[PDB]
Design a protein around this ligand. Structure first.
Ligand SMILES: O=P(O)(O)OC[C@@]1(O)OC[C@@H](O)[C@@H](O)[C@@H]1O
Ligand SMILES: [Ca+2]
Length: 596
């Protein structure tokens, strides 16, 4: 089970080690954020903002703006436009786990809306590991089945003649996506698979998939071979490590969003306007999103103030609600859910809600209706289940544009204000518009982001919406990440308080123990499995169990890594490690104290 795990380098021998050389870029520590754990709110905004801008930075080798990546984008838009020209029997599927699956969902929503607005039959669908419940809840373990990915693809593709399958996995990791790409390659008469991720192919996961005979790396290598015949495409730009190691929802999520929106817009422009995709025109769009970074981070002082407000509510416990209008609600939902595994948050801590119409978005909304508190997300859920129980310690962030129903915004804000003073808004406007006076009075320190008009004949209005969604994503992801960092939930720039919710996260947890303890691979595996299964003692059957067993047992547990790490550092029992942790103000402080 652990053959691919490299032995821990000896003390002082980490420099130039084979262990370090094998760390995927998506898992690497960012050299600019080693002191993220102790940074104040303003410094966290600066660090995370710098990292967010790295996706656009043009060595120029395989970067997002490189000729190589742009050429692949032109080729993929060429294949997509062939499907858009033949709606009868055509389909575009986007797929992934976690944030990658939620990005697949968002792309399908955006592009089906684009098609509906033009009076065309919608041709997009999404596949998210675990189904619709995964859009709103933490169900990361569902991506560990390649067969689940294949079964879901077969269901949506049944009866179709030509299917583009865009498999998204930031780490080139998810078994759900590997299975789909592999099966697409078995029938190139119908399927055109496109793999989107942010590692070199040689860094794709090569550990065994429990229900598949090829590893992700083997599938990606087969795609490279098929790309020579234009039968598959690997779209894997270099963006560099995340500010919080392995936090694929951040740069990886942003780069996924911009890469796909740009190439899909180019495919639609080819069909509708007759202008073929080009490197020049892809860059004009990508650079518009680059400008959105400056526009957004010009609000760094207010982003830091909001981060502190959210962190105060969490420290007291209170809950934080991110209430977004229309598609900004999807961005809000995407933010809250990731806090569960990233920081060990409870599902009640940070939750996003969508105000407005969601009727054409979900393919199986029955999987969500009256399913429990972990599945709330709608306008009705917010008004009927959340609002009546709001207290003075809760924070509510409202995200909207000046084109939204501002009477409805004002009504809901006033209802919330009766329960808590901790309200703030992120309002997007087009240069020329001003916020109604009653909203200026309700939000005297509103985060106002003003956007110049765009004059792209075809894509202008779509880009205007997309850049506001990206801007919202940067603000919310920086606020939620920072709010938890301020509470001592990370160590250096590593997710100390991670929940081991899937196999990728299990490997991250094991690697974290090797890195911070410096102890052997055997000792770190033993401590990790002992902490996961506690109070069940370790047995040979547990040591030999599939990783899925460890994930099932670990996924709802808190502080597994600091318990396993303190056990290694103090050479103590789990109960002694739990006592050490209980006596400290945070997991960050307990581990820093043990390391000193
Ligand atoms: O396949 P990937 O996009 O790398 O990662 C997929 C994913 O579900 O893995 C577990 C967490 O890291 C989630 O935040 C992440 O979206
Ligand atoms: Ca629990």
């Amino acid at each position: 089970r652990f053959q691919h795990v490299i032995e821990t380098p000896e003390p002082g021998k980490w420099e130039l080690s084979g262990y370090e050389a094998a760390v995927p870029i998506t898992e690497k520590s960012n050299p600019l954020t080693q002191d993220l754990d102790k940074a104040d709110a303003e410094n966290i905004v600066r660090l995370l903002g710098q990292c967010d801008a790295e996706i656009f930075q043009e060595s120029t080798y395989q970067r997002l703006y490189s000729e190589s990546i742009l050429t692949t984008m032109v080729q993929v838009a060429g294949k997509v436009q062939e499907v858009l020209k033949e709606p009868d029997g055509g389909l575009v599927v986007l797929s992934g786990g976690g944030t990658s699956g939620r990005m697949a969902f968002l792309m399908s929503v955006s592009f089906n809306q684009l098609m509906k607005g033009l009076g065309q039959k919608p041709l997009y669908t999404y596949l998210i590991a675990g189904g619709d419940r995964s859009v709103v809840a933490s169900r990361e373990g569902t991506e560990d089945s390649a067969l689940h990915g294949i079964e879901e693809l077969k269901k949506v593709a049944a009866g179709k003649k030509r299917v583009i399958v865009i498999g998204i996995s930031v780490g080139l990791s998810a078994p759900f996506v590997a299975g789909q790409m592999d099966c697409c390659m078995n029938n190139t008469a119908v399927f055109l698979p496109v793999l989107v991720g942010f590692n070199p192919v040689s860094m794709a996961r090569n550990d065994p998939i429990e229900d598949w005979s090829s590893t992700f790396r083997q599938v990606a290598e087969r795609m490279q071979k098929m790309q020579e015949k234009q039968k598959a495409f690997v779209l894997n730009p270099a963006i560099g490590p995340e500010g919080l190691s392995g936090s694929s929802r951040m740069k990886g999520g942003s780069a996924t969003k911009i890469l796909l929106e740009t190439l899909l817009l180019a495919a639609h422009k080819t069909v509708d306007q007759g202008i073929a995709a080009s490197q020049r025109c892809l860059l004009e769009i990508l650079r518009t999103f680059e400008r959105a970074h400056q526009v957004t981070y010009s609000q760094s002082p207010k982003i830091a103030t909001l981060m502190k407000s959210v962190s105060t509510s969490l420290e007291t416990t209170g809950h934080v609600y991110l209430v977004g209008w229309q598609t900004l609600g999807i961005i809000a939902i995407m933010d809250g859910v990731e806090c569960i595994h990233t920081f060990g948050a409870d599902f009640r801590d940070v939750r996003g809600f969508l105000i407005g119409d969601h009727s054409d978005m979900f393919n199986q909304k029955a999987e969500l209706t009256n399913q429990g508190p972990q599945f709330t997300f709608s306008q009705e859920d917010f008004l009927t289940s959340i609002l009546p129980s709001l207290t003075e310690i809760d924070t509510v962030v409202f995200i909207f544009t000046l084109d939204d129903n501002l009477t409805e915004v004002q009504t809901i804000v006033e209802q919330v204000k009766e329960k808590t003073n901790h309200i703030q808004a992120l309002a997007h406007s087009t240069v020329g518009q001003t916020l109604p006076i009653p909203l200026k009075k309700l939000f005297p320190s509103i985060i106002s982001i003003t956007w110049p008009l765009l004059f792209f004949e075809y894509e202008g209005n779509f880009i205007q919406k997309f850049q506001r969604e990206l801007s919202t994503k940067w603000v919310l992801n920086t606020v939620s990440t920072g709010a938890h960092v301020l509470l001592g939930k990370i160590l250096q720039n590593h997710m100390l308080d991670l929940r081991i919710s899937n196999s990728k996260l299990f490997w991250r947890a094991l690697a974290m123990l090797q890195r911070f303890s410096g102890q052997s691979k055997a000792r770190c595996i033993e401590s990790l499995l002992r902490a996961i299964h506690f109070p069940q003692p370790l047995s040979d059957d547990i040591r030999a169990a599939p990783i899925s067993c460890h994930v099932q047992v670990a996924h709802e547990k808190e502080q597994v890594i600091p318990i396993a790490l303190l056990s290694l550092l103090f050479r103590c029992s789990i109960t002694e490690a739990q006592a050490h942790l209980a006596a400290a103000p945070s997991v960050c402080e307990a581990v820093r104290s043990a390391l000193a």
